[PDB]
RNA sequence: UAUAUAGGCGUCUGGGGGGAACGCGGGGAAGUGAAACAUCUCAGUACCCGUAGGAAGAGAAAACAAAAUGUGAUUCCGUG
RNA sequence: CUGCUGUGAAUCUGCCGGGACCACCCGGUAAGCCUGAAUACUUCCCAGUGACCGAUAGCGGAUUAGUACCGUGAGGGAAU
RNA sequence: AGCGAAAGCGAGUCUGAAUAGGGCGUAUCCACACAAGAGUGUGUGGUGUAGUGGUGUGUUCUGGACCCGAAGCGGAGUGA
RNA sequence: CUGUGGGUAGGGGUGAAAGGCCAAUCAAACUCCGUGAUAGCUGGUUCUCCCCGAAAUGCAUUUAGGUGCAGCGUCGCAUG
RNA sequence: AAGUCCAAGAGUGCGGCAGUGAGACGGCGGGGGAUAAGCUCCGUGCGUCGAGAGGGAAACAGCCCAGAUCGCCGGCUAAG
RNA sequence: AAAACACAGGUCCGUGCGAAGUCGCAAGACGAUGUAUACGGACUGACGCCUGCCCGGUGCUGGCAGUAAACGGCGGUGGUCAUCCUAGGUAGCGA
RNA sequence: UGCACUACGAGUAAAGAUGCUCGUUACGCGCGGCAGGACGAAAAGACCCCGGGACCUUCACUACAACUUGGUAUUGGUGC
RNA sequence: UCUGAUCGUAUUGGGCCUCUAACCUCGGACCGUAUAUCCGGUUCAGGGACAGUGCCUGGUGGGUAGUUUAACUGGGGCGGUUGCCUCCUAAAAUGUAACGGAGGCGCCCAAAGGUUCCCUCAACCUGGACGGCAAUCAGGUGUUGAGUGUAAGUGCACAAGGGAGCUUGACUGCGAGACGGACAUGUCGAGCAGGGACGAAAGUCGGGACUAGUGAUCCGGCACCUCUGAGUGGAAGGGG
């Protein structure tokens, strides 16, 4: 059978142009009042998945 | 499975945006590459391509 | 609820740009600070909502 | 069978990251602390939580200044 | 019981049951997976019922399509 | 697209569709039917083939084989 | 050929009031200048970018999935 | 009391009620099928040599005899 | 700064494959216990066993000596 | 194998008749070829004793009259629901 | 039913030794008896804990049967 | 037009009363039928638009089914605990366990935030109507023993402690560089630009002396926007 790949990790996960995989940040969704502008700015933007995870990452998006 | 914790695959925030079934995109080509392909004529069209 | 959480919006823009906490047994009626307001991109005097 | 006792909360990780002598990029964490055990000195910036950061590239150089225990920051030569 | 019908009587033509797979229509699980579990999955599967034919079904646009002077019944393959 | 229950239109400036809905354009002419080929399968015969088995294997069954035997029965089921 | 949620633009692009900074991208390397010394850039020139199709092997996915092993669950039948 | 012939069938029967009996079995019979059920559990896993060679820790866990990531092995490439 | 440096078969980065995640005792510093336990929980570029044969402790995983490529009816020694 | 079940006896609830109840998707069946002195369900379990202060009216069967802790109340209080006579299986009676 | 020309004491050892250590005793092979050991046989401990299941209960959750309240279709006419 | 101000005026719901004709009757009589408590038909007698049944809709519902009912734990249970912060344990970097020893938190503040300027406490002694060891006053000692919203610790007399004035930086677009780290989280941050505050200026200000006061993802609200709109233009919906 061809090789289905995850739903929630091809919606979560993205590649760039050479191949890194990029991601978002978490705790940015609601209880945002009592966050600094300083926090929310950190949790912002795509950062590149951890090291430890690509293994699976690549795992779950390649499928 | 992560052995009962939440899943990097379930606790991160989903991607932004929406995916727009009507994109138009182009397969694209530079300039110098034409100039190196087709040296010494012009007259360039989609099939010349 | 003794301290609700309250938004604060431009009076000239009328766009709900700040967010606070504010106590209600303490200031009964409205905060009117004078925050700044990125659309008009001045500061003008905010309002509670 | 039971007390009150059991409760802890985590390390913060709190000490000097850079000792005298190692050469510091601006900016760099130099001293995490809780109150002001150490206090800056030039080139020597206090955070909000009393972290204590180098203004300037160089060298660290703990020191006093009238009975105050001082981080301060050399101009490193470039030879 | 009147109109008549149900019914009765006679006569001709047929059906009935079986069969390994394949078809069409209908009814329809649970084990399992989800590291529990109920939605969900398994699976419209197993099984059951009706009913064919050598195949069956479906078929001749109250269709797609997107401004292309577009294609022009259905079916079944490969892609997508 | 269809299934049950209510309500219930028009016949061509009619009606249906173009993924809520509205207007315009486009496509079609529902509520009637039939229709091969291209596709699925092998109970059973004719031939052949195997970098398949070779008697504890290959069919349960090269031998009284669904036999002996076991079970009230459904059924299980050899060895040579 | 990439960047963006996308419209879109394109060795740029997104954010942004910003020839402000940052992300992502411009195979890489080399030489010279112009700057710098908050960790190096910025330009120039050359240099040239390597994928894909079989097949072996190691993992992994869907399938029983290295082999053996429950108590029990459901369907249809058999038994006074 | 007993012969002969019958009837009641599985979430069902029958029960002067014991969770008794229903073909040597009953807190839901037997058979076949789904089915090679599933098992974080137990057991088993078959020829040789050469080279290298651990861990029994941290964090998280419907988690504590399981697992994910890090730590520690090995192989390849790069650096040195 | 040297040292080792035909090696530690070192370090780092990135990839294929892991296994491990039940430790034990002894020497030091400690908690709990009665400053009991062959108790229990920690720390220790501490050791050994685990996964380690040989010599001593009588026998005697973890103590002391010492890390087994093979052969010899050759020498020197460790602990004792 | 019993102290358990059953039992005869009793009490309550339901059922006015293809009844209630039960088996069936229904049709139908049993109940019952029975009819409230009967049938079903539930408790108790031969037999005996223990044990109501006495009838106006919330109301009831209705023709005024039952009735007993039918509902209080035991209170005056006979007495033993009997003359009159009070909206908790209850300390009536407290034996 | 792993073996076998299968002693005893005191030790040691996964802490209850035919098998190890040091000693003590014992000629080889049988027959009839006893039942103290071989942690004797038998039954993958029923106790206890962990995981799965089953059946039972309920003012656990979610459903369904059954009962039932309504609207409406069968469903009509007269009057007020 | 509606405005008078309620009279006629058309269909129409609800209620009541019935009626027969749909429908119902295991009430009777016949017929099919020789046999027949089946069944159907005819007829009379009763009900009757009720009932029953269909679709829809609420309620009761262990009668029945599918399942859930945590882990740690000096066995299990009972009892306790489970996240975050602060000490000791913890062996002078970081880190470090126990059902080890003590405590706190799930906020509060529109000023207790920003800035400018100024000041110094606690306690003791002296002597003054209430006044007392003790409210206020004066003087003298007083160097940190007071305070710091809130636990503890680290700090802070240069004050971060006490006052007064003005303000909203409890900003917007960002952030080189680092700390902590399985990962997800968590931290700090110079400096640039825009618009401000305070200060003559230098400059400080992206909440509070610092460390607790919190909850991923999914899903779904609200406001704004230049995004997208299933043929087109809108909208719906989606997006940021």
Redesign the interface.
Same mark, same amino acid.
């Given at each position: 059978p061809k090789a289905k790949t995850?739903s929630? #990790?091809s @919606? *979560?996960? &993205?590649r760039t142009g050479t191949g890194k995989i990029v &991601?978002? @940040? #978490?705790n &940015? &969704?609601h209880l945002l009042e009592h966050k600094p502008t300083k926090r929310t700015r950190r949790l912002d933007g795509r950062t590149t998945v951890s090291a430890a995870?690509n293994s *699976?990452?690549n795992k779950?998006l390649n499928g | 499975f992560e052995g009962g914790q939440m899943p990097?695959?379930?606790?991160?925030? !989903?991607? !932004?945006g929406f995916k727009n079934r009507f994109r138009t995109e182009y397969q694209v080509v530079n300039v110098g590459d034409i100039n190196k392909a087709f040296p010494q004529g012009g007259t360039v069209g989609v099939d010349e391509l | 609820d003794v301290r609700p959480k309250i938004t604060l919006a431009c009076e000239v823009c009328k766009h709900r740009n700040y967010i606070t906490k504010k106590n209600r047994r303490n200031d009964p009626d409205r905060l009117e600070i004078k925050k700044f307001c990125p659309n008009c991109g001045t500061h003008q005097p905010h309002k509670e909502s | 069978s039971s007390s009150r006792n059991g409760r802890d909360s985590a390390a913060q990780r709190l000490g000097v990251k850079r000792f005298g002598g190692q050469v510091v990029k601006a900016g760099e964490i130099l001293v995490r602390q809780r109150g002001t055990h150490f206090h800056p000195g030039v080139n020597v910036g206090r955070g909000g939580d009393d972290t204590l950061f180098a203004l300037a590239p160089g060298a660290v150089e703990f020191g006093a200044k009238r009975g105050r225990k001082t981080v301060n920051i050399v101009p490193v030569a470039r030879p």
């Open positions: 995850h929630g #990790a @919606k *979560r996960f &993205r &991601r978002q @940040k #978490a &940015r &969704r995870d *699976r990452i779950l | 990097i695959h379930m606790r991160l925030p !989903k991607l !932004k | - | -």
